Amino acid sequence: IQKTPQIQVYSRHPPENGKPNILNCYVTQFHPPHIEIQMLKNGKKIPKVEMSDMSFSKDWSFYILAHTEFTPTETDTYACRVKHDSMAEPKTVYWDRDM
């Protein structure tokens, strides 16, 4: 009926300061299929963020991959904010210089 989205932030290539990359945010296990994904660079939203098409697993929960083009910087933070019915308030997981 209602399930809180599990969130996961990770890069596409090994991040390296200054080198272009792609930041992936994989939201999952939620239900209903009505959630607003927002990708943030230091508090600001990134304008153009691509999202895949929403589909569901055989356990019927939904999933999606919002993602964008990013560059790792010693002074820059990135994060994925999720708004879902089943969350009293928005969940923001930030990204670690590892994933």
């Binding site: 009926i1 399930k3 996961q8 990770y10 890069s11 596409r12 290539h13 090994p14 991040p15 792609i22 992936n24 994989y26 239900h31 209903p32 299929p33 009505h34 691509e50 895949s52 098409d53 929403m54 589909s55 569901f56 055989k58 019927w60 929960s61 991959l65 993602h67 670690d96 210089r97 590892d98 994933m99």
Partner: protein, 273 residues
């Protein structure tokens, strides 16, 4: 040896706001899309028309264009007959498709989830309420089960059309389903809770197909204890996976990552130094 699935998602928030989008997969590569706003199914691959002649593909797509406007309209009649659980915000999913076996036949399926719980199926020649499915759904399926045309048309799509279509694809798609994409790897360590024991992390990304071996090594010594996580996707339809190992300071020296994957042969051994 592939699984063709076509997941449809209908959302009914109220009498005047419904949305049904769909998305098809051949294994783990998406081949099609049908956004509620688009009047025709969009291919998401060069070869998503299979070996279908336009005239026949076009005649097939018409079916769905008709089914849609209809399933959608009939849900509204359905919903009025929704006691006792009168609860308009209805989310319904439909997973249909067919697992393609070589020697064996293919296996077809049609599952329907109501409010995220699985409640009905199409079986052989008639639609049937699966256990746990609420009491009311019984009168609707019994009156639905009288539609010989639909249930004939279904037994066709289900039984006959689906495999016909799918082989075509394994044939034209052969190119991208057989692509051997090479992975990249990098390590990183994260300290644990309050204590001098951190955990080494091995990230491997950009590989395809899915099957990959990752594991921490100490020489020829395999580390029991390495814990492989979830396969996370990438926008290019490749995979991500990372294997961690909780160590203890001092003896992190000599440990390393051995990434075994089909596209390689002579594989990534990333020593931690």
């Amino acid at each position: 040896n592939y699984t063709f699935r076509c997941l449809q998602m209908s959302s009914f928030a109220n009498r005047s706001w419904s949305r049904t989008d769909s998305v098809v997969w051949l294994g783990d590569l998406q081949t099609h899309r049908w956004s509620n706003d688009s009047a025709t199914i969009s291919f998401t691959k060069p070869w998503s028309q299979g070996k279908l002649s336009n005239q026949q593909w076009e005649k097939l797509q018409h079916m769905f264009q008709v089914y849609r406007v209809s399933f959608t309209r009939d849900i509204q009649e359905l919903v009025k007959m929704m006691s006792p659980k009168e609860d308009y915000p209805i989310e319904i999913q439909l997973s249909a498709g067919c697992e393609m076996y070589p020697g064996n036949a293919s296996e077809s399926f049609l599952h329907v989830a109501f409010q995220g719980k699985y409640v009905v199926r199409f079986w052989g020649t008639s639609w049937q309420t699966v256990p746990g499915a609420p009491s009311w759904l019984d009168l609707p399926i019994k009156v639905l089960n009288a539609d010989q045309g639909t249930s004939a048309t279904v037994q066709m799509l289900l039984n006959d059309t689906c495999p016909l279509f799918v082989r075509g694809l394994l044939e034209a798609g052969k190119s991208d389903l057989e692509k051997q994409e090479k992975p990249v790897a990098w390590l990183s360590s994260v300290p644990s809770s309050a204590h001098g024991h951190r955990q080494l992390v091995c990230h491997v990304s950009g590989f395809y197909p899915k099957p990959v071996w990752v594991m921490w090594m100490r020489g020829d010594q395999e580390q029991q204890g390495t814990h492989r996580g979830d396969f996370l996707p990438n926008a290019d339809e490749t995979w991500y996976l990372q294997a961690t190992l909780d160590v203890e300071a001092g003896e992190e020296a000599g440990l390393a990552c051995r990434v075994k994957h089909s596209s390689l042969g002579g594989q990534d051994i990333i020593l931690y130094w």
